[PDB]
């Protein structure tokens, strides 16, 4: 797929606001993520014993990779379609060493895009949505291609 430069604008004017606190929404869609399928936190053999969202936000080391995953997709969403250096190692281990199957990809990009809602309103309306959709999509199927290509995925 490709998107449009105009489409990249609208995805990347909400991303310089997620930007302005990179910690906090790394908690938030993490937080998320693992309150909406609980069963992508058995894949975090450093945080799997947390027990709730109170526990979780007050996990120092879950808020320190929050900020390394977001800024990861903050470099690749930066590229505009040109990413496939970054997916490289970032395929390899997920697929590899990880284990994470594509749907949970899917789960992570709903968690995503619903805290934007949330703290955005204003600059993530539907056509902002449906732009960062549109990334993220490409995204995982950039990224399952790859999956592909190291024996993982299908
Ligand atoms: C927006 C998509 C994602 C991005 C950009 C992302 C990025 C990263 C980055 C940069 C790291 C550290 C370097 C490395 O191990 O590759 C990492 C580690 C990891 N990721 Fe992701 N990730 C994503 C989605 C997920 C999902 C959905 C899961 C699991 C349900 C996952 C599970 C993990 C685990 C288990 C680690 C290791 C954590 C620790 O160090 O122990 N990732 N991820």
Do not use: C
């Not at 975090?44 to 800024?71: N, P």
């Not at 390899?92 to 749907?103: D, L, N």
């Amino acid at each position: 797929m490709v998107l449009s430069e105009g489409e990249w604008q609208l995805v990347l004017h909400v991303w310089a606001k997620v930007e302005a606190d990179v910690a906090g929404h790394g908690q938030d869609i993490l937080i998320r993520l693992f309150k909406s399928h609980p069963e992508t936190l058995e894949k975090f053999d450093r945080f799997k014993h947390l027990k709730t969202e109170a526990e979780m936000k007050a996990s120092e080391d879950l808020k320190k990779h929050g900020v390394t995953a977001l800024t990861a997709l903050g470099a690749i969403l930066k590229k505009k379609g040109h990413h496939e250096a970054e997916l490289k190692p970032l395929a390899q281990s997920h697929a590899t060493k990880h284990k994470i199957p594509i749907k949970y990809l899917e789960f992570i990009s709903e968690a995503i895009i619903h805290v934007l809602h949330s703290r955005h309103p204003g600059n993530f309306g539907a056509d902002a949505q449906g732009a960062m959709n549109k990334a993220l999509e490409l995204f995982r199927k950039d990224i399952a291609a790859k999956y592909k290509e190291l024996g993982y995925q299908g």
